[PDB]
Amino acid sequence: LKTDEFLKAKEKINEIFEKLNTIRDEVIKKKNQNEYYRGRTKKLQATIISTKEDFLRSQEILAQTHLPEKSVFEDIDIKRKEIINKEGEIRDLISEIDAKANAINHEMRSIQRQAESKTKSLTTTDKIGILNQDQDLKEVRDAVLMVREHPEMKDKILEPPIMTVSAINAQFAAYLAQCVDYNTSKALTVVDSDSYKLFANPILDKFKVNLRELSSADTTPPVPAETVRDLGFEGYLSDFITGDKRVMKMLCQTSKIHTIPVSRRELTPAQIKKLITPRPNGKILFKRIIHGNRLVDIKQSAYGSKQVFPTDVSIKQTNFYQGSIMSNEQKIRIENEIINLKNEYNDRKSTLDALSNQKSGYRHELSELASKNDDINREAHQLNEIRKKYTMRKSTIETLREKLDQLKREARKDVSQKIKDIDDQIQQLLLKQRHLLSKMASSMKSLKNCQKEL
């Protein structure tokens, strides 16, 4: 009840001792941080003086007057439209050059015709073109262009004689019409009495044709006719035209082909009142004789005075003289030479085309050269791509201005706020320690108790 608790003095002194303790260490603990923050402030000062230098160190190159170029992009545009213009001009030039190259290729193809026709009678060659002697021979051309398709017509009714009984050349090709009569000449060469009618279907309704026959029955094979031709004739039908058993078997009794000599030395028939000489049967021994092309016929009559009746109408011929070679002394060129001079007529326009395509190539080369000049100019102005890079260097230093301003602003906020933060944290601690001391200032009240109240 009464004083039996003398330890109350110590009980009270304990806590106030711990309070005289405690806060004293927190004093310096909190004091510490402001020094490191001041060190950071010194770092800020160093950085911002560095930025002070950086202002001018940048501005020396951060002109902004060396701006992205005023009109270089317009130059880019105009030269690009220029190269598209060059491309269009090149397109037109190459199209026209191709057209003119084809134009000259036209002579390159047609020049074969003037070489093929460079012969007498406007054409003689071993190709199909020989039939173009007449436009109306379109029928024979079509006939020959399809005769070879059949399995055996090509070998049973052969192509026109000029291809199978070909004459030596023009000087005998004209004679071919009389060697094999003109009607059969532009017909097909029937081979036998079976080809007579068996093969009319392919061509008869389309192109003109004719047939020939022969017979040998009773007792007398062919009688001599070879050497009765002693009238100064040595050339003969079946050799100057390439005869063969493939062709001329049937002609022995249809066209009377046994009377067509060939003559180099022309002699007049007027020296003849002798060939009346009959064959032993009383009929004429001589049937027909020729010199040059003066063919003469012999015929028979069985009534009246029995007088003879020759005739001189003969086939066309080019010359009659007794000399040698080229047949023409007065002048050389004839109507025959117009389709040959077609060569010079082609050559005129051809030289014009050649020089036209050559100057077109000149223009093509000049256009390509201009385009490449514009391309090297484009390269010389893309070299300006580095001059854009000053604007990159200008921008990056410009961005460094932003970064240094941001650093100044953020650090200014950082240091200033922390200064007051630590100062106020110290200030509140200054109040806490003093209020704690004031609290202690009442503790000694216990001293007056105990020792004497006991």
């Binding site: 992009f73 690009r80 598209i84 436009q135 009246g304 109408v313 961005t399």
Partner: protein
Amino acid sequence: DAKVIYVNEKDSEHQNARELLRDVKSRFEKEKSNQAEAQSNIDQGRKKVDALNKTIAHLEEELTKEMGGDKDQMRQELEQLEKANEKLREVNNSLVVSLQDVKNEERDIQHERESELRTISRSIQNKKVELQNIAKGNDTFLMNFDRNMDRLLRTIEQRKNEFETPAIGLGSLVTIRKGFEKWTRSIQRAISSSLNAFVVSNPKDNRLFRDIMRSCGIRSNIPIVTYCLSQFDYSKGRAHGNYPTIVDALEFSKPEIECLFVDLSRIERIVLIEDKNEARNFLQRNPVNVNMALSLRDRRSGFQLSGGYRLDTVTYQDKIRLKVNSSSDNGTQYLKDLIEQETKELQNIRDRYEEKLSEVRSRLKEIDGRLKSTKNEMRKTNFRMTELKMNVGKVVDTGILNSKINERKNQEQAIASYEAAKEELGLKIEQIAQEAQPIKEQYDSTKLALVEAQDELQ
């Protein structure tokens, strides 16, 4: 012994331990607060990273909005499409060089124009032959080429009495008898020699010609016939038929010309039949003296009904002197049915065959529409290459203001250094933890223990 103040000095024990008490906890707190500051710096830097990511995204937005970032994807296919345009214009070159031979094609086919005009020209010119003018210059009724025929009869006949032949000129004599008109033009192919003859029958009267010919102003030197005008029999060669033969077809202007024909042409056996497309058996049965029959289709061609055993196409001269004894009522107009069919035929050919001309014209229309489409394709390819040209012209040009990416990179290395500092202070926290505890335990053990018997006076 005396229990006295000897122990008082032990109070200094607590102060020695306190000296390190202050230091250990002060260091621990200072370095852990430094770690806290470092972590706050990490947070500050990290909160900028997403903002800077969005800032570089905004740079990409600027590129897209100014058309700077469009060509980066495109360029690698732009080159390929430029090569595609190159090969397409090569194909166009192949097509145009496939569109000039079509011009050679049109030239070659319209060579049919020359083919048809050459044939038509002569045929149309023959349309002139009805009247024009008569007599001295009648190039299709009483003349053909030379303006001297009348003088020939008064020239070569001047000394007829020296001829070994009775004569009056001799082309003016031959004429056709009754029958059918279109038979006129077949006989000349055989008797052309007698339509310009002046007959003599000895070598010298025949040789005087070539000399005296030019004396009177004519140069023609066509060959000559040998004969002597007289009349004789022709009995056992005629055919078994009533319809006229060539002897009947030809009129006896002079009966001696009958024997002339019989001798130099053997015409007495020949007959005439209007068309080839007609009976065959009458000629085929082959009794004795069966002979050929003639026929004509037009002025340019004919056919031979040669007994049926022979059928041949025959040719006749375009220009012919032979004429018929028909009256002069209206001449050709009495006959125009059989002339128009020979001239209007070619008009029908060109009218009907112009469909082939129309066919090639339609082919030309198709190929020139192809040409126009290829021209539009050239234009389209030019536009397609120009769009690529526009795309590659910009690429980036001057559209770069991205130094904030360099700012981002320096901030990235800055945050890397910040994390390095965070790890260094992570080492520091471990250092203080392993330094504080060994001394803190000693402090607490001593402080609690070293209070000891403090003031045990009694």
